[PDB]
Structures are given as C-alpha cells and as structure tokens.
Amino acid sequence: LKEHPRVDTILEFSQNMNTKYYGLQILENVIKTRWRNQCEGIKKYVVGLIIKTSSEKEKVYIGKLNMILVQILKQEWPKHWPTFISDIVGASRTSESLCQNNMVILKLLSEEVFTQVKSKHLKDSMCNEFSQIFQLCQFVMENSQNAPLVHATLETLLRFLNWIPLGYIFETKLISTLIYKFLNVPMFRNVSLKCLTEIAGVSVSQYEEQFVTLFTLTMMQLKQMLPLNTNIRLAYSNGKDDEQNFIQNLSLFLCTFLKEHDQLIEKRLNLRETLMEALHYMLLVSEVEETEIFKICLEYWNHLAAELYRESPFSVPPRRQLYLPMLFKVRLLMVSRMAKPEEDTDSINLYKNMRETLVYLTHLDYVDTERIMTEKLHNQVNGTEWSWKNLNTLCWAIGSISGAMHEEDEKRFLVTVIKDLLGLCEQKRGKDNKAIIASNIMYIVGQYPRFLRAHWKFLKTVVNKLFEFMHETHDGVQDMACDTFIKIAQKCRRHFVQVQVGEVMPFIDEILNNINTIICDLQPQQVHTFYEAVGYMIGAQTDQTVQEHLIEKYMLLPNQVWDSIIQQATKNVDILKDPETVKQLGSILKTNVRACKAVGHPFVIQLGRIYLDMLNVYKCLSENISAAIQANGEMVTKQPLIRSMRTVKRETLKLISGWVSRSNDPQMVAENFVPPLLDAVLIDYQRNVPAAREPEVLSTMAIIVNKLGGHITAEIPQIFDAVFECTLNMINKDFEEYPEHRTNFFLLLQAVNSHCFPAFLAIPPTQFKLVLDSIIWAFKHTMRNVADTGLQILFTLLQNVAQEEAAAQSFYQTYFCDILQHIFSVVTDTSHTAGLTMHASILAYMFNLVEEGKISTSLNPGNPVNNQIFLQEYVANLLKSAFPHLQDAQVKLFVTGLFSLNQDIPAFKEHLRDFLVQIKEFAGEDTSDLFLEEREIALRQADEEKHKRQMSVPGIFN
Amino acid sequence: SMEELSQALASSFSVSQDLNSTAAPHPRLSQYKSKYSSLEQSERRRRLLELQKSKRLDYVNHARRLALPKHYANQLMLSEWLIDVPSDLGQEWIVVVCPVGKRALIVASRGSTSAYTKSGYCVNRFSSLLPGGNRRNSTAKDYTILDCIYNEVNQTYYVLDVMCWRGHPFYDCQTDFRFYWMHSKLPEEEGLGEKTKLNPFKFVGLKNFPCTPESLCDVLSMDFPFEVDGLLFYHKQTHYSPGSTPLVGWLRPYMVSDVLGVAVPAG
C-alpha cells in the first residue's frame, strides 16, 4: 500500500522504530528501479549510516544496510565511483570495527562479480582495484589479532584470489603465511585451506617452484592435523561440521592440486614419500561414506586413470611405474564401491564415471583386475564379506568392465565367475538368498553378449533357464528373467532366427511352439516384454517368406482372441459395449503395438490381417463413446467403461503410428493404409467434443506425413479440414489445457511444413491465415520448447515460400510486416529470450529479402518507396515506441548497422545482443539470459570431446 | 569346461528346489539330469498321505484370512511331472483334462470376485455368482475359494478344485470328495456357466475320469469345449495343500502313450 509514491527515508529513518525494514525496502526499491545530485546525496547518506552503526543486536540491520550499498555499487562502480576502492581501504585501515564490515561488504560485492573474455578484461582493467583489496588483507593478516576480523578478511581473500594479479599470490609470502600462521589454527583452518586450494587451481607456466612449495608445506601441516594413520572414514561420520568440512577441503586441495600440477611432483625424485602421502590421503578419504565426498575423490581417480591410460595404454612406461604401489588399491575401490548401474542424472553419471575409471585401470592391468574380482568373489563364498549389497556391487563391477578384456581372456574369466556364482547359489540357504544370486548371475550374463554369441549350447542353456524362471513365484525373479531375456534377444537376434547352429532347427521354432507353456504364469507387463523380445529374433530373419511364417505363428494367440471377439461383434455389435471384451481388445492391441515395435516393417503381414476390422472396431467404439456423452455429457469421460474404449482407440493409433514410422514402402502405405485410416479417424475427431478427442489422431497424422511427404501431400486438405481449426481453438485460449494436443498440433504443423509445403497453396487462404496465427501463437508462448518449435516452423516457412515466386509475392505483401511486428514484439518485450539465435537468423533472412529486392513491389502501397528504406524506418519506428527512453540518434545508427550485417549471421547476432546488452544495463538482472544461448553450445562441445574420446577405449561404451 | 558350465547351469541352478518341477521339461525329455529330478515318487507320496492323516495345521482360519503360505502367493496345489507311475493308478487316481489357459486362485468375498496368479499378482477384481462374489450375494462369512484355469478365448474360469464354499473349507478333504462337492455346488447357481452383467465370467467345472487303461483310451478320444493343454492326475485321497506335490501328476497329451505305456487313438 504505502510504498508507492527517495525523499522520505532520509527523513523517516532518523526518528524511526522497528518499521525501519520497510524504509530500507523502499530505498532499495528506488535505487534498483531508476539509476545526478539526487543519488549522489543517497550514496553519501547510505555510507554514513553504516559508518555510524558499526563504530550487537544491531547485527540484522547492518546486513540489511550493506545489502543496498552493494545494490547501488552494481550500477555505479567503478566508472562513476572511482574512489570507492582507494577510499574503503583508508577507512578500515584505521578502525578495526570498520574493517570488519568492509570485509563483509567486499565479500558481498564479489558475489555480484561471481563471460570468459568478459571477466579476463575485468581482471585486466580493474587491476588497480584488486591490487589494493589484497594489500588491505595482507596488512590485516600481518598485524591484527582480532580473530573475528581476521576470519572475515580471509573470507574476502578467498573470494578475490582469482582476480588479484598473479605476482601478489606467488611473488609474496602469502602462501607461507597462510600455511604457517593460519592453516595451523582451528577456527581459521577451513578458510585457510580453501584459499590454498584456490591458489592450487591456478594454471600457469611459471611459479613452478612456488607450486612445489605449496605442495610440500601444506602436506607438512596436514600430516599434523589429520595424521596419515587417522581413520578418516570414521572421523568424518562422527566428528562435527568443523572436521567434516576440513576433510572435504583436504580432498578438494589434493585433487585440485594434483590434477593441475602432478607432473611437477612426479619428476622431483625427493618428493615420492610426500607424493605417496598425498595418495595415502586420497585412499583414506575415498573410504568416507558420504557421496559428495566420494565424488571429489572419484574425480581425482578418473584423472589419474585417464592420464596413465593415455600414456600407456597396454598391460613399463615411466609415469605408471610411479603409481604401481597404489594402483591396485584404486582398482579395489572401484570394484568395492561400484554404483548401481543405469539399470538420477547424478547417479547415472556416478556409475558412468566409476565404469570409466575401472575400464581404464582394467586396460592398464587386466590380470590384476581379474584377480581383485575373483577374490571379491571368494569372499562371498567365504561368507567373510557376504551380503546382498556386497554381492550386488561386485556383480555390477563385473558387469561394468564388459568390453575391456580380449575375447579369450574374457571367456576364461566368465567361466570362473559363472561356475563360482552357480556354486554360491547351490550353497546359500534362502529362497531369498538364491533369488539375489540368480539375478546377479543373469545380470552378468546379460552384460556379455560377446560370450553368448561365441557359445551356442551355453546361450541356449541360459535362455532355457530364463523360461524356467518365468515360472518362479519368488519376489522379482520373473521380472529379472524377462528383463534378461529381452537383453539377450536384442543383442543375439541372429542366433535364434531361422539359422540352425550345431543342430537341426532354428531355436525360434521351439520358442514359437511353446509360447503358452512359457508365458502362462507371467502378468501382462511381462508378456509384453516377452513378445517384444521374440520380435527382435523374428526381425533378424532375412528370408521374407520364412519370416512371414514366423510372424504368423508368433502372432497366433492374440489373433485367436481377436478373431473370437470380431466374430461375436459381427453376430452382435453390442458385444463391443461389454466391459471385459473392451478390456481384452485393449491388451490385444498393446501386444500388437509391442511386437510391431520390435519387428518393424514386415509386421505388415500382421497389421494387414487385422486392419479393417480394427478400424471398424474403432468406429463402433467411437459411436459408443460419443452417444454416451450425447446422453450424459463430459462427465462420462470420468466413467471406467469409457476410459476402456478410449484405450482401444489410442492403442489402435499407436499401433498404426508404430508401423508407419517403421515402414519401408511409401506407395503401399499411401495407396492402402492411408485412406481407410483417414476415413475412420478424421471426421470422428472433428464431431467429437474437446474432451473426447484423441491426441494421437494428431501424432499419427504427424508420423505418416513425416514418412510419406509427397506421397500424401494430396490428402493434407482433408486432414486439415477435419483436424486443423477445432484443434487450434482447443489450445488457442492458452489456459494450458491440452499439453498433449499442442505438442502434437505443432509436430503435425512442422511436418506439413517440412515435407508437404505445396499443400499450403491447396488450402483456402482463410485456413492458411489460421496456420500463421497458429505459428505466431507458438513462438509467442512462454515455455522454451513451444516457442522454439514455432520459430523453427516460421523460419522454414520463410525459406519455403521463397520457392514459389507467384504466391511468394501475395504472401510477402499480406503477411511480411505483421510477422516482424510480432517477432520484434518477442525480442523487444519483457524477454523470454529462449531462441535469441533463432530471432537472429529469422530477422537476418527477412532483411535480406528487402535489401536484395526480392519483395518486388512496395510494402507501403500509397507512399511507394524502396522497401529497405521503408523497413529501416518501420523498425526504427517500432523500436522508438517500445523504448521511448531511447535517443533517436542511436536508433538510426543501430538499424543502419543491422542491414549492413545481413548476409552474415554470427556477427548479426552479436550486434543485436549488444543492443540488448547496453540497453539491459540501463536495466539490470538480464545479462545471463541472453548469454544463456552461447553457454549450452560449450557443454555440447565438452560432451562431444568427452563422448568421442570414449570411442578409442574398448569396453567404456559396450 | 564350456560343456561343464552349461551342464552346471542347466541342471544345478534353482531358486525353489522343487522336485520334478514342471517349470523345466519332463525329466524324460531333458538332455541334462537335474539334481532336482527324482525318478522316485511313490515313497514320497506314501509318506505324505501318512502325514495328512494327522492334520496339524488349522485351515478354517486360513480360508477366512484369504477373505502354510503368507498373502495371496503360492496357494494352489501344484503337480510334479508324472514320472513314477503308481502301480495302483487305475484304482486310486483320477485324471482331469486341463484347458490351455492361466492358473488362478479365485476368491469370492463380499460382493466381488478377484483372480490371482500363482505369484499373488491380482489379475482382476470383478463380479460373480459364487456364494461371496456379488453385492446381493455378499454376507456373513459366505466366502468361497476356487482353484481355476482361466481360458481367455472362452472368457471362462474352468474350475479345477474347491478349497472353500459358502464359508465351508475343504483343505482337509480328499480329492474324490472335493471334486464331488464342486460338481454338486456349481450347477446349484443361477447361470454361472452363462454370461450376465452380474456374472461377466462363466465358471464351468472340469470333468475328471478314472485311470484304468480303457478309461484313459476313452478320455483321449473325447472332445472338449477347449484346446487341450494337459492331463492332471490326482490321487483320490490327497488333501488340498498349497505347494508342489507328487500326489498330483502332470503330462501333456503327447506324453501319455510313452509314460503310461498305454494305447492311443488318432491325434
């Protein structure tokens, strides 16, 4: 209410009470919103308050005041507050009380100084400013004996170490002072170490001796506080935050230091003992229970392993020789702490990293790794380390190295692994124990197709056991049995399929013949996996006619029920209103969907068998669903029998989708499946109320478009007739209502646009108008995904419309302006700057058109003028209206700069963001939003260099 | 070694070490002999019939609990493969011809009828004309418990045994009795064997037949309203007890000729 009308608080805070938190909130407001003589009076006043205040209950108002001082500094400093840094030293350098708060303030400020060349420049330019901050600190560290002050000082040093010039760090006595005077001491020791690790991260070519010294002295002090015979593992879990964080900091130090500087220490032959002592620590900390601690240790081990692998990479090179005394301990650690395999983004990573490290280490010495594993196994048989957790971990680690050994080595290894676990299973007493073991055996086996493909009798023995276990009622052994069966099927297809091995028939024949015997105790979800698994096998049959016969035998059971239902429907249509019949059709379809997914194109012999009946059932249930709603309305959707029919429609569409996208004969699809489909689904979708409309009608249109392009361009009018308008209404009054229907609508649009463009001319203009409104809505939406799609369509529509000169001009004349109006309206506004790079390309393209004289006739038809002038003005016009604050001299010059950067996109991008760079700095919080685009394209180069380095490592990807 | 590995995995790798389990093929058809195969069955059968005689586990309460094993898993009496053919087979045993389908524990309890797999995974919860499986037929302890093979294509629960009927438990009765009770209680019910909104699934009981050579011959030549999955051989006297038992024997029809050394017509 009250905080609406600067002048007030200067007066208000003078005789105030507790309500002062509003006055501060009012001043912060004015400062952060609009930002000479006025605010110059504000700066002076603000500083005065704190100088007074801080020279204890007062504490909360101090931070509150400090906050705003930083708020202003973010806008003023240093170009229009140059003294600040020279001043703030002076004040503190005389009053300890004052020095406390300045440290607190400079710590706060650096949290608004948190882009690589941008920061590089700041470190260059503001060089003077930092220099003094460091010296203030030095002096304080040098002389003060006010503990609470010294702490705050150190906080600030840390916070600034990356910005203060190098020589101040290395050509001083900083390093030694920190290690001797501070690290040494309990309440200072954490910050001390953070600083030293911060230093240790510095990556340069000089200061070699200073680094080496930083290593040996810190080690020396460390060995004194947590001596190398401590049980860090236990120290961590027991001890307080104090001691916990110290351990975390220790590892952070050694890891940072060694990653960047190990080579230095390696070479200095007098430093082994101490090098080994650092590893000793890394092993001791690697014992720590907590994940966040392990993650840093693991980053270190991965570094070490990768270095040695890149030196080596066989099974003695000089750097390896250094580390042999402790390498097996790293092997041991991975094996004994292997994370649950991918079988959330953090945990996948955690496993991936551990796999990677172990795969490196395995290449270095496979014999050592096998031996660690064999022995971890013995200890499950011993009972000395027996536990479900332990056996699982072991087995995960065994599974994890699955490409790293040679065939022959692998074979020998697995043979002892399997035998021994088989033994372990016969020996343990539980049904519980036995299930845990049996899953582990199956898990391992599934990680090693290479082994299975090499030995038929064994593969076959394993698949038969899996069928046996598909009858086990114990907790999850039916699941592990199916899950294993699908892996093996997928990775060994050809071995099943009508290729005989050392015997009379293909094994697929024996499976198809005993399918009901096999699956009769599974539940639906498991039957589907079984069907999918057998699909892969059939998919491998290269002979088409042999493969037709397989599919028939394969598909025989669900076809029986299907046929029985259809027959009943034929005699009496009402059978399709029967709750159970409808539930059955649902699952027969889901089995079809699953088999089709696996088999792909040839599943046609099946889909074609049932297609017209299936589609007929679709119409009947459709007539049911709607007539139900036409006699009770919308609420009928709530009822369970309706949901049930709707699942049939859905799985119908999914099945068709599933096939078409896997299809390999567009003439066939076009002349044979497309018509009956279209009849059965389109008008239906139209006449149904918004609640009764299947979204998959849209995604199924989208797929068959993406797949057939020219082969169905002719049908697009029919499809849009029924589907285009009504679907748009459904989503246009945003009130996010049908997320599935819009994600679909746009996937269809984008498809028609990409593959069926000519259709847009065959639709009446009033409908093409609509297409545009709808594309316009898309790139106008909040959530990046929807925006990004809308842009993509537009940009393609542009390039595409160019291809047809006749109607190109109609479009340009009619829409051209309106589209910028709308695009600029998305760039200019309270910005969702998701697709800045898109905006760039779009605008660039559109400018070219006018520049290059491709818009043949004038946009202003009453005042004809060169369109590049008209646009140059029309944009300037639109800009000076969205930004009335902006000086009319900058507008002209900037709109000039743009068009002279059109036939080049990267620079046209930097030019435009820079407009918004300098114009959002007359605002504030923006920076990282526009910068967000560049950021991601550095992660995907870090992913691409990582992911492609993994290709050279056998077993890291397998 | 690789042969040694396969043999080890085929024949010595089991979670519940059931003798002559039908989860693996008939021992008479395995290339490997499991340690879980036993060509012996009579001694174990005699031994079990003795044990049954002195009933020392309360079942009356088990029947109501469901309205000795825990929740809804492994409640059905499951056969071994028929291997060691009883010398008094024809006098002391009967054969039930089974339909292709899925085994099901059926519990009709207060206005509803829910089916379970041997695993205890509920497969359906529905309505039935069985003493406890209807809102109108929902009463004070009128629950019934069946053992059925569900045939999806005829949408019928074929009844194989009865463990409880209208709150009366039969676990501790002989098979001849139990089978007699089901063939007498079933037809006593408004169109079970038919389809109504109140009874979605038909419950037909399965015929059983004597096991003299001539009788089996007849059986094999009969025509059934379903596709023949196999032949269950029950000892007339066995009580109902959940688990694998040698007191019931299973064979697929193509095996009867070989294992029982009897004639067969065309097939």
Curated annotation (Swiss-Prot), chain A:
- Phosphothreonine PTM positions: 345
GO biological process: any one? mRNA export from nucleus
GO MF terms listed in the record are: DNA-binding transcription factor binding; nuclear export signal receptor activity; protein domain specific binding; RNA binding; small GTPase binding
Q: Where is this region: Necessary for HTLV-1 Rex-mediated mRNA export?
A: 1-576
Q: Where is this region: Interaction with HIV-1 Rev?
A: 697-717
| Broad class of where this protein is predominantly found | cytoplasm
- Modified positions (Phosphotyrosine) are 351
The ranges of region (Interaction with Ran and nuclear export complex formation) come to 255-347
Pfam families from the xrefs? CRM1_C, CRM1_repeat, CRM1_repeat_2, CRM1_repeat_3, IBN_N, Xpo1
Q: Where is this region: Necessary for HTLV-1 Rex multimerization?
A: 325-328
Ranges for the HEAT repeats: 145-168, 169-205, 282-369, 412-450, 457-494, 499-536, 672-710, 782-813, 814-851, 899-936
Q: Which InterPro entries match?
A: ARM-like, ARM-type_fold, CRM1_repeat, Exp1_repeat_2, Exportin-1/Importin-b-like, Importin-beta_N, XPO1/5, XPO1_C_dom
Q: Which residues form the Importin N-terminal domain?
A: 1-52
The chain residues annotated with the modification Phosphoserine are 347, 928
Subcellular localization is given as: Cytoplasm; Nucleus, Nucleoplasm; Nucleus, Cajal body; Nucleus, Nucleolus
Q: Which residues carry this modification: N6-acetyllysine?
A: 590
Q: What is the effect of changing residue 325 to T?
A: Strongly abolishes interaction with Rex and RANBP3, abolishes Rex-mediated mRNA export. Does not abolish interaction with RANBP3. Abolishes Rex multimerization
The record, for PROSITE patterns, names:
IMPORTIN_B_NT
Q: What does this protein do?
A: Mediates the nuclear export of cellular proteins (cargos) bearing a leucine-rich nuclear export signal (NES) and of RNAs. In the nucleus, in association with RANBP3, binds cooperatively to the NES on its target protein and to the GTPase RAN in its active GTP-bound form (Ran-GTP). Docking of this complex to the nuclear pore complex (NPC) is mediated through binding to nucleoporins.
Complexes and interactors: Found in a U snRNA export complex with PHAX/RNUXA, NCBP1/CBP80, NCBP2/CBP20, RAN, XPO1 and m7G-capped RNA. Component of a nuclear export receptor complex composed of KPNB1, RAN, SNUPN and XPO1. Found in a trimeric export complex with SNUPN, RAN and XPO1. Found in a nuclear export complex with RANBP3 and RAN. Found in a 60S ribosomal subunit export complex with NMD3, RAN, XPO1. Interacts with DDX3X, NMD3, NUP42, NUP88, NUP214, RANBP3 and TERT. Interacts with NEMF (via its N-terminus). Interacts with the monomeric form of BIRC5/survivin deacetylated at 'Lys-129'. (Microbial infection) Interacts with HIV-1 Rev.
Annotated family: Belongs to the exportin family.
Q: Which PANTHER family match?
A: EXPORTIN 1/5 (PTHR11223), EXPORTIN-1 (PTHR11223:SF2)
Please identify the protein, giving its name as recorded: Exportin-1
> What organism is listed for this UniProt entry?
Homo sapiens
Curated annotation (Swiss-Prot), chain B:
Intracellular or extracellular location(s): Nucleus; Cytoplasm
The entry's protein name is: Snurportin-1
Region annotated Necessary for interaction with XPO1, chain positions: 2-133
- Keyword list, A-Z: Acetylation, Cytoplasm, Disease variant, Limb-girdle muscular dystrophy, Nucleus, Phosphoprotein, RNA-binding, Transport
Domain of life, per UniProt, equals Eukaryota
Residue ranges for the region (Necessary for interaction with KPNB1 and m3G-cap U1 and U5 snRNP import receptor activity) are 2-66
Q: Which disease is it linked to?
A: Muscular dystrophy, limb-girdle, autosomal recessive 29: An autosomal recessive form of limb girdle muscular dystrophy, a group of genetically heterogeneous muscular disorders that share proximal muscle weakness as the major attribute. Most limb girdle muscular dystrophies present with elevated creatinine kinase and myopathic electromyographic features. Disease is usually progressive to a variable degree, ranging from minor disability to complete inability to ambulate, and can involve the large proximal muscles, as well as axial and facial muscles.
The chain residues annotated with the modification N-acetylmethionine are 2
Query: Where do the segments described as Interaction with m3G-cap structure lie?
Result: 101-103
- Where does the record place the IBB domain? 12-67
Region (Disordered) location: 2-43
- Altering residue 56 to Q: what's the impact? In LGMDR29; uncertain significance
What is the annotated quaternary arrangement, including any partners?
Answer: Component of an import snRNP complex composed of KPNB1, SNUPN, SMN1 and ZNF259. Component of a nuclear export receptor complex composed of KPNB1, Ran, SNUPN and XPO1. Found in a trimeric export complex with SNUPN, Ran and XPO1. Interacts (via IBB domain) with KPNB1; the interaction is direct. Interacts with DDX20, IPO7, SMN1, SNRPB and XPO1. Interacts directly with XPO1. Its interaction with XPO1 and binding to m3G-cap U snRNPs appears to be mutually exclusive. Can form homomers.
**Would you tell me the Gene Ontology cellular component terms?**
cytosol; NLS-dependent protein nuclear import complex; nuclear pore; nucleoplasm; nucleus; plasma membrane
**Where does this protein have compositionally biased stretches of type Polar residues?**
8-23
Q: Which residues of the full protein are shown?
A: 1 to 293 of 360
| Task of the protein | Functions as an U snRNP-specific nuclear import adapter. Involved in the trimethylguanosine (m3G)-cap-dependent nuclear import of U snRNPs. Binds specifically to the terminal m3G-cap U snRNAs.
Q: Does the keyword Translocase apply?
A: no
Q: Name one GO biological process term.
A: protein import into nucleus
Q: Which family does it belong to?
A: Belongs to the snurportin family.
Residues the record annotates as the site (Interaction with m3G-cap structure) are 79, 118, 250
Q: What result is annotated for mutating residue 250 to A?
A: Reduces binding to m3G-cap structure, interaction with XPO1 and snRNP import receptor activity
Q: Which GO terms describe its molecular function?
A: nuclear import signal receptor activity; RNA cap binding
| Keyword Acetylation carried by entry | yes
